[PDB]
Amino acid sequence: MDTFVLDTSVFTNPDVYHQFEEDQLGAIENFISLASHTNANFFMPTSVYYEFTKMVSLGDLAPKFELVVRIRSPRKWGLMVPAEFLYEFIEEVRYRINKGLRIAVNRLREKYREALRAGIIDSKEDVDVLLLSYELDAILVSGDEGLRKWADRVGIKLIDPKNLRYIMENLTK
Amino acid sequence: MDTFVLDTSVFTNPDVYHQFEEDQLGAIENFISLASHTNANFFMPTSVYYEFTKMVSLGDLAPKFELVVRIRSPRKWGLMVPAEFLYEFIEEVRYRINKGLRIAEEHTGRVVNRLREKYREALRAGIIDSKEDVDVLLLSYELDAILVSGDEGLRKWADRVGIKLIDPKNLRYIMENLT
Amino acid sequence: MDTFVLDTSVFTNPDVYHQFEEDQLGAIENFISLASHTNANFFMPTSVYYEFTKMVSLGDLAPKFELVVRIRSPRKWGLMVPAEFLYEFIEEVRYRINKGLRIAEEHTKEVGRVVNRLREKYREALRAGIIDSKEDVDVLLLSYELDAILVSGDEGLRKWADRVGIKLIDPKNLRYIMENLTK
Amino acid sequence: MDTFVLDTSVFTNPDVYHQFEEDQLGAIENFISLASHTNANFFMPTSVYYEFTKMVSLGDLAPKFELVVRIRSPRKWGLMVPAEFLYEFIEEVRYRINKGLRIAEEHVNRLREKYREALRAGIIDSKEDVDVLLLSYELDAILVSGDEGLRKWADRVGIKLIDPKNLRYIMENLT
Amino acid sequence: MDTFVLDTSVFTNPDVYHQFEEDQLGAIENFISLASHTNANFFMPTSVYYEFTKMVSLGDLAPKFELVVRIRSPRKWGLMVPAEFLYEFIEEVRYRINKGLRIAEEKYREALRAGIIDSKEDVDVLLLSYELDAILVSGDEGLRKWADRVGIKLIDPKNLRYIMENL
Amino acid sequence: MDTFVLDTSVFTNPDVYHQFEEDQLGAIENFISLASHTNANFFMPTSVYYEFTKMVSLGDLAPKFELVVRIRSPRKWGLMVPAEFLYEFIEEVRYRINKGLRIAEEEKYREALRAGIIDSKEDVDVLLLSYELDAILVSGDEGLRKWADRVGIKLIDPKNLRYIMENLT
Amino acid sequence: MDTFVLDTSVFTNPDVYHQFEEDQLGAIENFISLASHTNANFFMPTSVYYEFTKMVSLGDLAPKFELVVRIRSPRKWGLMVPAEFLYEFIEEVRYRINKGLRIAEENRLREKYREALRAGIIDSKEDVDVLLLSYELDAILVSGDEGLRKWADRVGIKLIDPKNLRYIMENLT
Amino acid sequence: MDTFVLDTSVFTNPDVYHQFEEDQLGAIENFISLASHTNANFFMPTSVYYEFTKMVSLGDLAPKFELVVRIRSPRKWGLMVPAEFLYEFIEEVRYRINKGLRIAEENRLREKYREALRAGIIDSKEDVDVLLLSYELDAILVSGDEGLRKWADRVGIKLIDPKNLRYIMENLT
Amino acid sequence: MDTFVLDTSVFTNPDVYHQFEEDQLGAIENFISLASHTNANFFMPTSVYYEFTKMVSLGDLAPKFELVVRIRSPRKWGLMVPAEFLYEFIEEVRYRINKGLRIAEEEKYREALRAGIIDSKEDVDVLLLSYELDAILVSGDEGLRKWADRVGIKLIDPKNLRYIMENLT
Amino acid sequence: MDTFVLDTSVFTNPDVYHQFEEDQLGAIENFISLASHTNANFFMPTSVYYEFTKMVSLGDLAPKFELVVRIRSPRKWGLMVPAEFLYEFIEEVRYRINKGLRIAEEKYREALRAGIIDSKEDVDVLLLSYELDAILVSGDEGLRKWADRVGIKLIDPKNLRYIMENL
Amino acid sequence: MDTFVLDTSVFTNPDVYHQFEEDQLGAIENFISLASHTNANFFMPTSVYYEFTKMVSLGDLAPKFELVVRIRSPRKWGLMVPAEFLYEFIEEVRYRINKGLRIAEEHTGRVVNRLREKYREALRAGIIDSKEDVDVLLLSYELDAILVSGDEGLRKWADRVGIKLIDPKNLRYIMENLT
């Protein structure tokens, strides 16, 4: 039975969520409905779910979302990663900060200070996503191309996020 | 099938128990009834159950409650925790004591004497709550269970150490979808 | 050769340090001098040495002390303690916070400002009971890791050390022990 | 026999190097001379040595330095660090970026580059931090550093430490 | 399926056996009947069963009892307990005897030699419970507090009938 | 080099201490002096040393004693004993209580046993320490050394302790 | 399913075999009959079966008995017993002979005393065989001899009252 | 350096002790004297030393003997012997008693026959103790009893001719 | 399900094959027919089957026989036997040679032993195969089954083979 | 230092012992003298030494011999040989006896019962050599060819004196 | 100290042995003399030594040679080689047989009969040489020794499988620098 770990970008990037509906809230609702009738487990890291809720107001959808998408933390005890992964994470932080810095009087340096604090949060989400995907042996669904490139050098299973609805449909119990 | 370890706050904090009914005994009895018809195991550490019985008089409910919610002790023999966990526990005691000390101070010859006994009850309960926290975490770890809490402090420790969690406000909803 | 882990109390409790000299700074300086000519390794946890520097001002003694007493952190990686040590610590915490409350109140057994001064002396008591509990863990873990003899003076810590199988000495005989190991 | 892993700050922060000489190039030279007669091993990560050379021109000292201080890379092959360490590293990056900008903030076109530079050096110094810790862990060595934030981290992880102000002193008490 | 290890106290302390019947022999008889029709294994240490028979005369009930409640010895070969457990046992002996002599008011020499027999029962009970991963059913506060320190599964003995019924 | 774990009865039973001197305090003092020159390690469990101090007032000898005979606790962390040893302990408690009860039979019944428990806890501490250090158990108590024999702990005649100490410089 | 290892005494001591029938060969035949319709495995050591056959003639029953009661040797190849067990066996030899010696006390006196201890060691070798086989198969020892059952208990072998063997077999069909 | 485990028979059988001196207590004293100046460790099981003391009074010599010959118990805690060894011990009991029984054949007849087999099992328990201790220390067994030495050989314990013990000790000073 | 390793003597000793039929070839044929319907695996070592074919001419029965009783070699690669078994083998050779020598004593001395060696090699092949498969050894030879007993291999009375086969559909 | 395991053939076959002396008792005597002054351990299996004493009467040489040549049994507990070795032993027995009867020309029954005694010696020799990691000294072609198949260290027995001398 | 395993070709190929002297027996005896005063162990497989004795009559030299060059058999009991090695051996037999077949052909009613016996001696020696090669490699591996050969074919197999090598022409020089 296929397990998936979802990124923040799955429901915040329009290129991905448009497959459910053009509205954000409507796409999320459609996803939740479909997730009930599909033979799949969905997961999302605690940290990622937190940032998703800061961006999108789910309200009455939250409990249904939390029922179909299990929110687990990847911080297992005694989990060890090889030293190499540590060094690759450093490169991911570089990517994240510099990407945020590109998109940025003194609203250029409280923009800039906000960009790097977001860049750290995005990196701590990336590692949470990968670790959880690794632990569950799950398929990582993510609109962030930079994350997906890293999930490959590390050998995590992937899907084209644009085909998530399609995949889900062809697995209905 | 899903396993849950319940904290004391599941049935003592109104924000959580109101999903079952509006009376404490009503909520407990509604929970027990539903637990019978749900495909799930429930557990509560011995220490947590003890404090729960001091705060609430179950009476005739106790045997039914003890049947649906299994009371186990998490004090395993060959169990080992990393030295990290030990240091994290010290921070939880700090959190517990200082939160309990805030609430003593705020309520605030004769006024000096009610304040000393109010600060002793703040610390002693702060330690009791910290020992319960550990019991809850260890049991959750051992059974690979979903910790149902409500005490934001505990839930955030549970998260640091990778224990499974749920929003306690959605407990009834989850139970209803596992019948 | 013998290895020792030192508590704060070895140089702050007068019943212990008098063996070197009657003054505090004099006792510490005398200890350092003797430690140089003794065939023994001395250690103190980073957390404990920090509290020792907050209570006593070593000044020019610091570098000599830091040479004879090695200041190491016991927070090794993958160190695992059994789960019973977790519960025994919960109990030391209790003993500690309580001993302190005792002195807070018992010291304050003694306008309305009285209430605020009592409020502080209670606050200070728990904050220092948690600092002394963290010290206690640090001391035991360091003693365990090095297989060292714990020199304390604190009854509460030594009782715990004994429960967990850590080697102990009478702190009052430290100078004597050191003298019978000269190189 | 004692082993030490040196940080850049040992020879770039004056508060540390003054124990050898007031002069930077003289402190380094004095250190090198003493290291020859000291019963100790010295090490410095490859990345750390690279940054040290970009700040200080050693010239004819380089070969003597490279003989007394062995320049090794900690990027071993089967090394596994706990997942926790990974999260600790993220916090170290936060500390170093935020320390860099606090410096930057104080001194429009010059500001955008003073802020790029703040965080590119912030990442480089975080990579140096990891290199230093991993090498210290691998060799079971005593980490000598002037940076507070690195020395604070070397404690959470249990790496052996020294007051850098006492380095000369320690070296002298080992022949 | 839930396994259980029974103490002597289950059928000798009236507070516990009254749930089956007011009569002692009738409670045992009722328990055995119910045990047949419940999806649960029952066990009792050799040493505990011996003392139970010295106190209660079962007569024709014995073979039915021995069929529903399996009598095993916990003395498996190569079983190792942590040194800590050994020290905790010493404390249990202290508890057992001190209680016993309170009760003295030749009756000192019986309060000792019974206090140790009760201690040997306690160990046999805990070890068997540990080995089978069973739920310890016991009236005795002291045994149940020790069982808890060592992480053995417990039940309120007063709800034994109720639990059996719901299986 | 030879390691020894000492019981309480080494310095509290006259049959054993007479080899050092006729006086108790003098035998202890003679032992301490001889221990300093001897090529052997001496040890005594914490619990055993405590009871020894309650019986004998060492005074100024305590620091010299605590230098020659090292007072360790045998309650090591990951230590496991076979379940059989646990059952052997129960028999030792019976031996100790019944011996203490015979002598009582002339509050002296209540403390005939409370001492019997303390003596049994000491016995365990002595055996475990002996096991851990792979040491020779020196004890005058018959019952303890007969147990020590069942569990394969090395033994000596306590009456020959001085002689053995002398044959090791 | 339950497994049992049988002693000689289960069919030679009258106090146990009377549960099947009053006559010895009749009891054996009833047992065999019942064992066929029982949901249980029966075993007896080779050495024990040999002495059983030297005491009872059996004849016609032998092939039926050998079908229901499997005769195995417990001398497994890599079996290790604790040194302790070795000492315990010396005590069992003592018990076995000194018993034998009580009967004898009731030339021929020598010829009775020699015969007493030679049968004593044969019975000791039976005891070992029985315990080892019970251990190997994790079987319930059905004996009748108190001394063997006391030993079996110290060693933690599963036991039953031999007087209830028929009853147990009946409740497993 | 060479290690030896001694039997009772090394100082109770005259055929062996005569190499030291004709008198028993004189031989023991010479052995003790020589053992002091020998580069070799000597050992004897607790059970063996006990029976040795019940046969020879010794007295004055005891502390010197206990210094040169270390009296250890071989009942080590985690010792495992193969099941095979257990069977071999049953044969040793047989040998030991049937021998004992030959002497007896030469009331009192009973009191001689009881005494014969009680000493036989005591000697069997000695044999085990000796072999186990020899095994544990990797020591050379010095016996005098042929039956024990035959066993020691089947088990692969190191052996010496007891008649050459003095000679061996002399060539190690 | 039950597995059996068969010796040569199962079909070459009349005391054993008479249960199937009075004729040799008829007993073998009856056995093969019964084996097909029985819920049991049969095996015979390669070496044993070779000698069986030299003694009895199976003709058209061979393919049916080789279908019901599987002919395997027990010379597995990483197989190790304890050194004791090696010494036990030496005693088996002595038994086999001396038995063959008694019967010889009436080139019949030279081949009294050469057969004794072949029979000893067969014995080893039989035991090793039985050990490997955890099979029940069926053999009429007294000496072999008494060895099989010493080494803990499962056994049956060969006289009851038909009866056992019948009680397994 | 080089350890050696000696066969009977070392002191019973004249081709080998002639290097010490022409006389048999003198060769043994000479060997023992040299053995004392050479930096090498010597060993011989129990079974081999027994047969050696049945053939040669040593008398007063025995204790000196037993001091220089340690007589151990190879029957260590738990030693395992590969199944292959077992089959190779069968072949050795075949070799030993077949040789033996050639020689027959009651003398058939002795050529067998000696052929097996020689086989049991062969195993004892190889196992001891294996256990000690020793050099096997043997006159017998057949034993030395087997020793070679199993990877045991060998020497030419004719050069034994020479090797001892250079140590 | 350095250990060496010698091939048959060390003393039979002149290009190698000429470093010691110009006569075969001269070279062997010079080698033996030097081997006595060098801090090095020498070994040769039993099979290799056998073939060496067939080709050269050592006589009185044999005991001295056997003392300096230890003749061991590499047929270890628990020794395992990777299945690669097995396939590589087949290629070595191909090399050996085809090299030996070339030399038979080249030398080349009566001519047919000397050619059949010349092709049988080419194969049978080709197998003998292949078994020697394996013995040499296995012994070298077991002792972690330096293979001294000269047979270019063997040296190139030895290299594929990571055995230590030396130029055989420098053997004397190496021995001289280890005195």
Residue numbers in the entry:
A (entry chain B): 1 to 104, 123 to 191
B (entry chain D), K (entry chain D): 1 to 108, 120 to 190
C (entry chain C): 1 to 110, 119 to 191
D (entry chain A): 1 to 107, 123 to 190
E (entry chain F), J (entry chain F): 1 to 105, 128 to 189
F (entry chain E), I (entry chain E): 1 to 106, 128 to 190
G (entry chain G), H (entry chain G): 1 to 106, 124 to 190
Task: Reproduce the article's own wording on this structure.
One of the first steps of tRNA processing in nearly every organism is the removal of the 5′ leader sequence by ribonuclease P (RNase P). In contrast to other RNase Ps, HARPs consist only of a metallonuclease domain and lack the canonical substrate recognition domain essential in other classes of proteinaceous RNase P. We determined the cryo-EM structure of Aquifex aeolicus HARP (Aq880) and two crystal structures of Hydrogenobacter thermophilus HARP (Hth1307) to reveal that both enzymes form large ring-like assemblies: a dodecamer in Aq880 and a tetradecamer in Hth1307. HARP structures in additional oligomeric states have also been published, including HARP dimers from Planctomyces bacterium and Thermococcus celer and a HARP tetramer from P. bacterium complexed with Escherichia coli pre-tRNAHis. These data all show that a monomer of HARP is a VapC-like endonuclease that consists of a PIN domain-like metallonuclease domain and two protruding α helices, which are thought to be responsible for substrate recognition.
Molecular replacement revealed a heptamer in the asymmetric unit that, upon generation of its symmetry mate, produces a tetradecamer (14-mer) flat cylindrical ring consisting of a radial arrangement of seven HARP dimers. The structure was solved to 3.2 Å resolution. The angles between dimers in the 14-mer structure range from 48° to 54°, and the distances between the proposed tRNA elbow binding region and the active site ranges from 39.4 to 42.1 Å. Despite the additional dimer compared to the dodecamers, the Hth1307 tetradecamer maintains a roughly 42 Å distance from the active site to the proposed binding site. Experiments using His-tagged Hth1307 revealed a single oligomeric state of a tetradecamer (14-mer).
